[PDB]
Amino acid sequence: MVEPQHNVMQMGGDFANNPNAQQFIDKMVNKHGFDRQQLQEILSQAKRLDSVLRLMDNQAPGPNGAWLRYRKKFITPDNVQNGVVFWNQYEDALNRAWQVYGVPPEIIVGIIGVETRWGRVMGKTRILDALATLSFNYPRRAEYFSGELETFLLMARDEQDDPLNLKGSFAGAMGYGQFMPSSYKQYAVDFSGDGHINLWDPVDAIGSVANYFKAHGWVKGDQVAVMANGQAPGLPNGFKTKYSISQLAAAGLTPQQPLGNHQQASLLRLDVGTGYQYWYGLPNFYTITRYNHSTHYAMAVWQLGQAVALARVQ
Ligand SMILES: N[C@H](CCC(=O)O)C(=O)O
Ligand SMILES: N[C@H](CCC(=O)O)C(=O)O
Ligand SMILES: [Ca+2]
């Protein structure tokens, strides 16, 4: 009946003679009470995906219209129209997310839109393959991904999912909002109320994105960014920059909208082909970058959300 298989200490597959996989199994058994043989069966099926390693390497750390090209990948009639459909379909969850977390529908709709086109593109790679590959055959970020794999397996166990059935991005991101295992653990919420946190349930995803935003400092009703009149070619730009409003004014900029009580801001510069468009980046813009560290990403999420909000009014 019961087969302990104590003598089966060697697994097959792509990670068969991998020291990192062996150490990982030992950690899961010692730290979390996993059964070595059960874990060996799972990992013997895990695949080493060279494409994952190559993409992770390809992303390792004008005016020619850079922003225009990025923007048009997300802000198109088809995308905006689909965003309207998603918003209307899940309006109750979105409104409830606004009330509980203070994060507006346009922001959540923009995030889910840029991330997966509202569930249309959620990834085709088995999460286990991606995470095992990055944990066992990628020294540069082996520690970060081993932590993600550990959390992934714990998530599967708790939510009673088969670790091998879940698919997502090349980095192991999952569902509507493309949450990493660590984000599921720290920020995902059962917004649908059925007692289970499912990253593939749009209602849960909506609440999880909102909670993620509030946890990262989103200020309800605060401005995201304000476009500037003027140019500031001398000053370095990017979402990580920081200047007092006085410095920016001295550099030749004026806000198109009142900045209120804000005394500092980041200097954002968008390449609009004919020249540059400067913006005063406010705290909420930086909060968007906490989801994906990119000025273009944050601006696309925000503007996509605004475009959908407007298409809804019509
Ligand atoms: N994506 C991270 C970027 C690290 C960073 O520059 O903060 C990596 O590949 O390590
Ligand atoms: N899509 C980005 C480039 C676009 C941009 O952010 O300017 C990439 O894969 O590198
Ligand atoms: Ca749920």
Mind listing the domains of the chain with CATH numbers? Answer: 12-60+124-188 (1.10.8.350), 61-120+201-314 (1.10.530.10)
311's tokens = 């298409």
Ligand 3 centroid to 110 CA: how many Å?
21
70 lines ligand 2 (CB under 6 A): yes
The Cα–Cα gap between 98 and 94 comes to 6
Q: Exposed, middle or buried, 264 (CB in 10 Å: 0-12/13-18/19+)? A: middle
Experimental technique of record = X-ray
Resolution in angstroms for this experimental structure? Answer: 2.0
H helices within 5-119, ranges in order?
19-32, 36-43, 50-58, 66-74, 77-89, 91-101, 105-116
Chain-centre distance for alpha carbon 117: 13
CA-closest candidate to residue 225, choices 312, 288, 313: 288
Which of the residues are catalytic? 115
Hey, what amino acid is at 298?
A
60 lines ligand 1 (CB under 6 A): yes
34-65: burial string, b at 16+ Cβ within 10 Å, e else: bebbebbebbebbbebeebbeebeeeeeeeee
18's tokens = 């991998």
Q: Which of 55, 56, 59 to mutate to test the pocket of ligand 1 (most atoms within 8 A of CB)?
A: 59
85's tokens = 């459909």
